[PDB]
Amino acid sequence: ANPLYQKHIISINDLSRDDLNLVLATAAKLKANPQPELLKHKVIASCFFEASTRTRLSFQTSMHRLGASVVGFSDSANTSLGKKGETLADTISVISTYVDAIVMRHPQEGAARLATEFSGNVPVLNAGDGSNQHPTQTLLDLFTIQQTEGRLDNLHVAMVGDLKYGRTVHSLTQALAKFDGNRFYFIAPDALAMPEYILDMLDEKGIAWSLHSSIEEVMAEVDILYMTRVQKERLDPSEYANVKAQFVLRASDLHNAKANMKVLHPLPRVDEIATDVDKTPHAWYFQQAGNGIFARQALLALVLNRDLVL
Amino acid sequence: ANPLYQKHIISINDLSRDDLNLVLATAAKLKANPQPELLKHKVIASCFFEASTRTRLSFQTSMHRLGASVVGFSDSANTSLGKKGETLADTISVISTYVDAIVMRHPQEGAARLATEFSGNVPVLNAGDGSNQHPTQTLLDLFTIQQTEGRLDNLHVAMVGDLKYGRTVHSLTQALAKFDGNRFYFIAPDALAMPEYILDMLDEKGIAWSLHSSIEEVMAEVDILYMTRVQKERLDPSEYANVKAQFVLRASDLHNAKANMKVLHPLPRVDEIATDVDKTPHAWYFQQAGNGIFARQALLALVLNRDLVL
Amino acid sequence: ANPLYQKHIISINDLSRDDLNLVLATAAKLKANPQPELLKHKVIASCFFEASTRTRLSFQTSMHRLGASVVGFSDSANTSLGKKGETLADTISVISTYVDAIVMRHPQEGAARLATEFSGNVPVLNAGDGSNQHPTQTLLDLFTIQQTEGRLDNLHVAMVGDLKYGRTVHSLTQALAKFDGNRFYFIAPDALAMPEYILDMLDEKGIAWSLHSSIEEVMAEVDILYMTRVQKERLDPSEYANVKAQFVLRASDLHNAKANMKVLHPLPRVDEIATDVDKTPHAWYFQQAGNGIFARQALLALVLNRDLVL
Amino acid sequence: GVEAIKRGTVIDHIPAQIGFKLLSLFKLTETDQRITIGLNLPSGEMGRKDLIKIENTFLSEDQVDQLALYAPQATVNRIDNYEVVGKSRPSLPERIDNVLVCPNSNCISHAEPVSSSFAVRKRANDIALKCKYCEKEFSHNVVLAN
Amino acid sequence: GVEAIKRGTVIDHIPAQIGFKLLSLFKLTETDQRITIGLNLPSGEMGRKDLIKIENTFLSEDQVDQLALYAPQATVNRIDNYEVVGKSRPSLPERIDNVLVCPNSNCISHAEPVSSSFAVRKRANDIALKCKYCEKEFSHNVVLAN
Numbered sequence A, B, C: 001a002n003p004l005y006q007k008h009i010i011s012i013n014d015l016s017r018d019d020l021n022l023v024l025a026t027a028a029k030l031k032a033n034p035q036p037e038l039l040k041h042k043v044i045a046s047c048f049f050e051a052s053t054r055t056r057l058s059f060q061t062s063m064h065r066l067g068a069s070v071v072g073f074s075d076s077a078n079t080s081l082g083k084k085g086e087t088l089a090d091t092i093s094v095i096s097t098y099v100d101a102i103v104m105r106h107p108q109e110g111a112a113r114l115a116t117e118f119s120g121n122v123p124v125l126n127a128g129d130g131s132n133q134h135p136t137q138t139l140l141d142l143f144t145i146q147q148t149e150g151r152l153d154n155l156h157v158a159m160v161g162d163l164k165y166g167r168t169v170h171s172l173t174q175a176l177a178k179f180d181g182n183r184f185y186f187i188a189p190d191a192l193a194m195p196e197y198i199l200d201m202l203d204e205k206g207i208a209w210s211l212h213s214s215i216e217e218v219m220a221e222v223d224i225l226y227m228t229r230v231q232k233e234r235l236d237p238s239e240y241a242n243v244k245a246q247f248v249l250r251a252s253d254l255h256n257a258k259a260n261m262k263v264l265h266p267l268p269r270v271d272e273i274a275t276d277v278d279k280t281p282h283a284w285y286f287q288q289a290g291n292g293i294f295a296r297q298a299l300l301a302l303v304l305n306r307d308l309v310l
Numbered sequence D, E: 001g002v003e004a005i006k007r008g009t010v011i012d013h014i015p016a017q018i019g020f021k022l023l024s025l026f027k028l029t030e031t032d033q034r035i036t037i038g039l040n041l042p043s044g045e046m047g048r049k050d051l052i053k054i055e056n057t058f059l060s061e062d063q064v065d066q067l068a069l070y071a072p073q074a075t076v077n078r079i080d081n082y083e084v085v086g087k088s089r090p091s092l093p094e095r096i097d098n099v100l101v102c103p104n105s106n107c108i109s110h111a112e113p114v115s116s117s118f119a120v121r122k123r124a125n126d127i128a129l130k131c132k133y134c135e136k137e138f139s140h141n142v143v144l145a146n
């Protein structure tokens, strides 16, 4: 029985340094040695009530590479929840009588945890719930940080952008706070700033963080620079002063950067990383993206297999 | 003929203390002694390309109260500009061949200046061009300020609210900088603060102005507290942080109010002047509204009659 | 001054048989002898916040036929209530400082009563507030009923159609319950049946009323067959079973019609009165419409003149 | 058993279950006066009653009559310096303004800054309520909502 | 005593203007046993208190845990046969369920058939409550704002 077998993967909070490290260990393994029938005979539900190119298509590809079958929807417009007014609670109750695990993305925060109260014994893996958590992202980010830096302890990590509505950086700061010695630098418009609930936790653990007005003032000290997109669709109309990106990285700005530094982005990006960065050795966001296949195969394997030997 | 006969009225910045004084003299006269046939046989166009309750009806009632005839539109939608794609310039060119004067409200700034190049010999009276000027508003504000304070010189004047798109306060700060020793207190959000070009003019005339973050700071000191509306329609999406009234006024606030002071508002008031102010000695905005009839028919009379009314 | 000078006209339930009789007397007089300058120098507001062809144009023509001036709006969309979010209460507060009387049609019930608390000294004439009252309709219905039947007492009156939202029949059942020995036949669908509160009043005055499922049942017996429209706009979705005229009338039906009987309709008629009725001796609804000029200018005259017209 | 009171108003004999309802319908609690309410007291007269003593507070004539809509058999006792100086009784008010909301959805009262008002009518079982504005009559049961 | 009950609860040292919310909140008036309420009585240290006396009735856990969040000052006294058998002041819980409402409008708790739940981190500052579903932590002032 492996520790993540049959677990719901909802919030990074619910996971430990050991849980995280087991998926990265598994990830690197499946990356070196494919297992094309590991999940032979399991049918999995890909329920996306909100737009995606990467999490949905990476998830469905990971499922296929392991031998599983996928059933789902790209938008609820067509479901009886969308057309006939059924509840989410009821949608999850019947879908759980059909399948072996539910992968879902949803626009309200808390949808995922709500679903687990109705999934019976079927694992719910959270693909994003509004602006709350995005754990599977964080797993593929931790995997990429490890490949590029060889350590997840004592790094200098900067998070730039819309840190308020970004489920991505919410999960990532929580996961990195589970390792020793990591220093955080936060560059956001103050209206799209990091929740004090994350901050209180960084202060509850005695981790060091600072806010900066510019990227250029920390460029020289970072291992990882994590850019984010302004979640337009999540902004309250009070924050529309913030729709266009305040900090935009251009190739020239990397001039005094550590040779080992990487620019990571969850993606999609809009105007914030100028396409000229793409040609530099510091750009690594598409590699990061490819890395979602290994991290999402590892997680599916551990949740759906009592013991893995690979 | 009197100073203003056949004269266009587009911006307060083209009038003089003498003109403003004349219009108020005549208003005082006409209020005392009606002239029912004064403009008997005159047809005036009421052309509002933008919403109005106050300006359009006070203007048309004033026309009727001097024996005039009104033709026009409350909406551009069923004009040939509106449906057949005609330029303003040609609208003005044909409408000039029909009426004796044109009163025009338009959504673009400078629409009325544009109109005087095509109205031929016909006077164009600006009823508000976007966020620029509202010269008739100001003549009834001066009429109400002189009615209450007995003078237009040596007044303490707090202009609260949206000072950036307030076509009203653009014109009124300019009318009052023609008289002497007036003291200005500007209380806007930073976003919707008074135009620089206004401030410059105050600086050159050496008028004392000051910025305040509160009505309380100036309450005890002022004579005219002139409140404005956030010009919701004219805001940028960036600016939608300020859709609500930062400074809202209630009757409690008047506690440390100078016993001569009057609360003025061009109206509509939305949330910024609490309905309890409506019963205070101080509230004067509905009287200010009615004062539109006198100032408006004094203007009409001067521009369409050579002979000064008496 | 005559009973109705400066008096607001909001509901038939506030008038008396004496007032109603006066208004008809004056209508009879004025129809015989026009008074072209009667209201020379008076400005009246025509404020229709709701559609009208009949009420708005009969009212404004009557104003013109007594020498009055009309200002107003046929639509609220380009008023500052309509676009700048102003309350009715403040609309009425400024418009009171301009005109001598206010004629108002509004979609909410009680809009005109609300208006009399803010019109100051100005009379508010109710042109129809939602489904409640239409007092001017009724004065021209009484004028037409007395014109045809020679009396307002001891009449057999069938009110067919939508009796629930028929602001017209609310007021008319109340005007006719002031005279004597009138017999009421109410023919609605159950859904759109006459309000209880009306019935109660009939009960206390001991007026005989009865419900019928057919025009034929009452045809031979009645003197005034008064037809109504299903107030499509005012129906609940639940009620959309009754969008079409249950009782439709054609000329054949008049076969067993009492030779004095008249078909009346407030209009618009949609499908309920077949165009063949238009050629019968019985059809009187267009004459009823024209009778609006006389009743309407008699009302205006009484409310704005002290001296009874002759 | 409840309390000695020098000066104020003691609404006595309130029907059980109507005492809390009155204290919330007319803002009686929103005071800084000592109020002492005794709910579900034995009466004999009725099995149970309720009672409210509001110290140093006197109700106006209309104030007391408003109570007839929920507590007609109450006795409003005026006490000045321990002496029952007065024993009033609620008659029906002719109008109740400001506390009720019209069940008519399309009534102007919901949109504009005016107080509510209903004319009270003793109809034929219950008390009928006519809105000032939309002019529709509703039974009082209804007006006290859902 | 200052009233007297054989069996029952006497909640006391209730802040001025909270006592009456508690009657609404804990639904205490849907009852038939005697209630004595003393609104705006003295209390030396903090001048004006409220006191509620539910005869022959004791509160369920949830209520005293709620009482901890609405009236931390108050004291609950279990009286059996006039014996003040117990007098306890409420300590805060770990979690509050089915009564609070999340400030986050985009919480799934609004839309869906779920009982709410909150984590109670006593901050030195004030009380921080964490929504079970959306994981936002809030100030108890924010959450309890009525």
Ligand SMILES: Nc1ccn([C@@H]2O[C@H](COP(=O)(O)OP(=O)(O)OP(=O)(O)O)[C@@H](O)[C@H]2O)c(=O)n1
Pocket (backbone or CB within 6 Å): D003, D004, D005, D006, D010, D012, D053, D075, D077, D079, D081, D082, D083, D084
């Ligand atoms: N200083 C006082 C005087 C009177 N009361 C209250 O006033 C009410 C009515 O006055 P009273 O005549 O003293 O009692 P009753 O005679 O019983 O009144 P009723 O017979 O009408 O019930 C009583 O319930 C009593 O509690 C009081 O509390 N304190």
Ligand SMILES: Nc1ccn([C@@H]2O[C@H](COP(=O)(O)OP(=O)(O)OP(=O)(O)O)[C@@H](O)[C@H]2O)c(=O)n1
Pocket (backbone or CB within 6 Å): E001, E002, E003, E004, E005, E006, E010, E012, E053, E075, E077, E079, E081, E082, E083, E084, E087
């Ligand atoms: N038979 C009883 C006994 C007590 N009480 C009430 O219950 C409380 C008993 O608590 P107690 O501690 O004995 O009185 P205090 O010491 O003054 O209250 P505290 O210690 O909290 O200040 C008192 O308010 C009293 O009115 C009661 O109604 N009936």
Ligand SMILES: [Zn+2]
Pocket (backbone or CB within 6 Å): C110, D102, D103, D104, D107, D108, D109, D131, D132, D133, D134, D135, D136
């Ligand atoms: Zn109503």
Ligand SMILES: [Zn+2]
Pocket (backbone or CB within 6 Å): A110, E102, E103, E104, E107, E108, E109, E131, E132, E133, E134, E135, E136
């Ligand atoms: Zn929540």
